[model samples]
Target: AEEEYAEDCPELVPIETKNQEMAAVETRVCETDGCSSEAKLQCPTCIKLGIQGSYFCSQECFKGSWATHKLLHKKAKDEK
Candidate 1:
């Protein structure tokens, strides 16, 4: 049924990446205080750019990390 629906509505590309994993990877915290979380958070800038999958510790952190994420989209935009 999903396949049929997808075929009928090709524009609706299902969000394939698992959100749980996405959330997990972004939110991973080490057992230490005063140490920055090495967990790879998502790009809030990309999220602002209308990109899904952007997960971050906080909005302030996201703002700080926008430059890094925006570069990724440059390559993504050129892809087929």
Candidate 2:
């Protein structure tokens, strides 16, 4: 099902890892085409933080954001 999109935050998990659970979890498309596949998917972690959507074209693209994405996770988790 379609859901709200996620913003391009500095912190996010690697697309490579998320893609593995693509089918199992829900995802929304990122408005920007920066992702490798450009498909919309929700960040499972971000969802908990009230983030609605995050997009990626493919695993490669997700990995590209890993450095920054990972920071988001750290920040969120730390807040918890």
Candidate 3:
């Protein structure tokens, strides 16, 4: 009976995941010039434009480079 049960069982992975730690799978770095921090914050404007790869270490960094960074969003919209 045990042998018949084993035969019926399919050979597949038995691992189960809750995916809680999946957020750490990919590391993103800040896009601000001269600052190479691990970026956890992103620009709202970029998120709106759908080209959301732009990352910043913090809000101050985003403000500091707004003049240069905003142009990138403008060019992206123009490309659309």
Candidate 4:
């Protein structure tokens, strides 16, 4: 049985490097008022403009805060 299995099995194995480990373990707070939750999303425009403190716990929170958030986006854009 060992000899039969050896004939069908390939010896070379590929290693995964892309998804090996987290770059950093960061904990973020949701920017929404009256809500305490872990933030998982960051504003792309904020990142592009190097602005900080722009994370949302959920899509609902983000959408609800869009009016205020957009103001920040506008400010950041106007500065540049």
Candidate 5:
């Protein structure tokens, strides 16, 4: 996935450091189940609802985690 994401956005890599070089403590990431890129793709539904963490790396990545997406939405409420 890193390889794929690497090509997706070169500028993102140097700035995407998650706990590797810079913790940035908490960071934004794709919400597609176990998928990740954190570059900048988002869930329209989440955005409309004022949710803040439903980022997906690619547009297609949204369906990649179709099995777990709604649950993620639910958890946001539960977590709150």
Candidate 6:
């Protein structure tokens, strides 16, 4: 009886189960020059202004580039 039941179901497992195990990984790069660290922070001003690709590797790098970065915010605000 067991042999007959097994024979009736050639493959009980689903083929998609293996495909589900493979997942895609996301990565973000820093915008600071000469820095290679992964960016995890987004500039609020840039986001509000709808400017993309303004990720920073660290607070220090962000602050260091504030002089230039603030210009983007100013320009955005002016255009708005």
Q: Which parts of model 4 are misplaced by more than 4 Å?
A: 1-27, 76-80
lDDT of each: 0.41, 0.51, 0.60, 0.59, 0.53, 0.59
1-80: candidate 5 lDDT, tens digit per residue = 55541111111112223455553556667766476576365566555557766566765655556456655556534453
Better of 2 and 4 by lDDT: 4
Worst 10-residue stretch by lDDT in candidate 2?
Answer: 9-18
Tens-digit lDDT track for model 3 on 1-80? 55542212112121122455746456667787788887767666665577756777676666776657767765733453
lDDT of 1 at 48: 46
- What's the C-alpha lDDT at position 42 in model 3? 66
The best candidate by lDDT is: 3
Could you give candidate 1's per-residue lDDT for residues 2-75 as a string of tens digits?
55412110111222235555345334432123335543455433444576554444445544454454455555
Candidate 2 residue lDDT tens string, 1-80: 89974655333444433445546764445534454344643355565665545555455556566547646655535453
Taking the tens digit of each residue's C-alpha lDDT, what string does model 4 give over 1-80?
A: 55542211112122112454668445577766656887766666565667777777777677667657666655633453
- lDDT for model 5: 0.53
Clashing residue pairs in candidate 6 (N, C-alpha, C atoms within 3 angstroms):
none
Error of 3 at 26 (Å): 1.5
How large an RMSD does model 1 have? 14.0
Report the number of clashing residue pairs per model: 1, 16, 0, 0, 0, 0
Q: Residue 1 lDDT in model 3?
A: 50
Q: In model 3, how large is the Cα lDDT of residue 25?
A: 50
Q: TM-score for each prediction?
A: 0.32, 0.37, 0.59, 0.53, 0.47, 0.53
Off by over 4 Å in 1: 1-52, 76-80
Give all candidate RMSDs, comma-separated.
14.0, 12.8, 21.3, 19.8, 12.3, 23.7
